[PDB]
Amino acid sequence: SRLLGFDSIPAATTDTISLPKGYKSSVLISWGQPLHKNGPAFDPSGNGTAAAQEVQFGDNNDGMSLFEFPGEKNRALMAINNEYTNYRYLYPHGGMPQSAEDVRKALACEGVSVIEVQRKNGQWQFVQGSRYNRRIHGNSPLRISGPAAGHELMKTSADKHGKKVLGTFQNCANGKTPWGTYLTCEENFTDCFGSSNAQQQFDPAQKRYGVSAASREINWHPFDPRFDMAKNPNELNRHGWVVEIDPFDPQSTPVKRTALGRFKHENAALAETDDGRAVVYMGDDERGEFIYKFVSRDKINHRNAKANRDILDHGTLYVARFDAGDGNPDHPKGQGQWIELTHGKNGIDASSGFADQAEVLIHARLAASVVGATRMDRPEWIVVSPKDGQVYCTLTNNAKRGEDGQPVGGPNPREKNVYGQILRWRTDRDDHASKTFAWDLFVVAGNPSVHAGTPKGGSSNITPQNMFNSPDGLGFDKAGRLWILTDGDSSNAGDFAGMGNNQMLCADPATGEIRRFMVGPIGCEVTGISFSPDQKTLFVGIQHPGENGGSTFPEHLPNGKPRSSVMAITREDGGIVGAHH
């Protein structure tokens, strides 16, 4: 291959970072790092306060973007998501929150960490004390904008006007706009809500989004009533959005962009129509949910960044339908289309339960079911090639594929899918404004050591050497290499025998060739990817090392506490990461 400059590494089970010959890794920043001058040191005992956590790097770092600093090649800003927390390590008691301060501490872990990084002797390092350093967390004051701002469904007793919301949490992955802003995506936000009424009767929209009275083992609602559906049911509507942040303005108020719809947002991939309007491809990460596309009303003003202030408030939301494909067992190919989610179109009207467009966006999942969107195997990250504009989407797995309502077909070709696949599409005429596209399965993950000669063995670009499961994250570099990050079963046993710990692989989109590049430590997932502008440093996140108690990464102190970290990968020779030596 022209693009793959390293040899595929073996799978690993060690509590370390494994890389190819000639590569090195360094910890850029870890959960708990104070961001400001004289800030509170990380306390490995768990006794750190919620107020200190609000000024420290958040937990479980996930999607991230790097922004070049105008006029200074040795500076950059990074906006890094903090998705959730690990109660076994957050609290001294190691269990569920026991107080309002414990709840505040968990909310402080989540959100976004904006940091400055500087280079000295080729090595990028965190700059504690930079004026750009900032935490945006679960209790931060945010604004709501777009078509659902101010709607009755967005009003609560604490916010009677439906335009001011506390926090962004469950921040999964990201987007980077061409107007210098950062998009952060609220994914499993519903897990945080419960009810003080164990017999609460949830309405169809609440049930579709998966809320329950017990919460999904988060248990904030007994201490903070904002999360108690018996008292503040509309608070559920004020989360599950894409949030826009300006990393260069530390006093700016982040904005929830309701025009992009409400669902369990994984990431937000940017592209542009041939007539210059912004496009945002978005996955809803839940078994049997959909893939969405937002197209702005107005043209992007590339040379006047602030003229795009509210470009994401006006536009059109679509959802995908994919056909059955050609039935190819290895490389199925087909067509699909984008179906508009607008009140008064495609059967979305009062006869199907939608009074206005705000309700269509707040309950986008329901409107998408009305129009006949294709139920997918858990869409996670979406990326757009900078070389040819083709779009790539992980479909991480779907243990329920084949049950009633989720038939096997087209881009979801296997029942009880434990491995996942990567879906690709090419917008017609290579114009992102097109309502139709051609699709193919770029890779169908599998285990040819266990299941050779069967669908569970994967596609022919999968071998026992490079095999992996549950692709989640994706990233392109400027050369056109496609980086694949995994969040799968790390047991290295049964269906996952020989896959080892979670990992990162590199692929050539034009040939389908995939090589394993990095293996992460015990209990982690590999998530978050960004490159330095010169492409000589690849930044990648190690999330929840030791989720089940088997790691001390990265400090490796005796009976130590593992910490999610952002790693800086470089070549010892100083060349471009992934390229030939």
Ligand SMILES: Nc1ncnc2c1ncn2[C@@H]1O[C@H](COP(=O)(O)OP(=O)(O)CP(=O)(O)O)[C@@H](O)[C@H]1O
């Ligand atoms: N109690 C429960 N009921 C229903 N769905 C659940 C569940 N616990 C987890 N899930 C969902 O099942 C899927 C698999 O769970 P898991 O925690 O393994 O996923 P994950 O690590 O992929 C989450 P993420 O998408 O943030 O990376 C996810 O989509 C998760 O949201």
Ligand SMILES: [Ca+2]
């Ligand atoms: Ca993910």
Ligand SMILES: [Ca+2]
């Ligand atoms: Ca995942």
Ligand SMILES: [Ca+2]
């Ligand atoms: Ca995960």
Ligand SMILES: [Cl-]
């Ligand atoms: Cl179709």
Ligand SMILES: [Cl-]
């Ligand atoms: Cl573990």
Ligand SMILES: [Li+]
């Ligand atoms: Li253009």
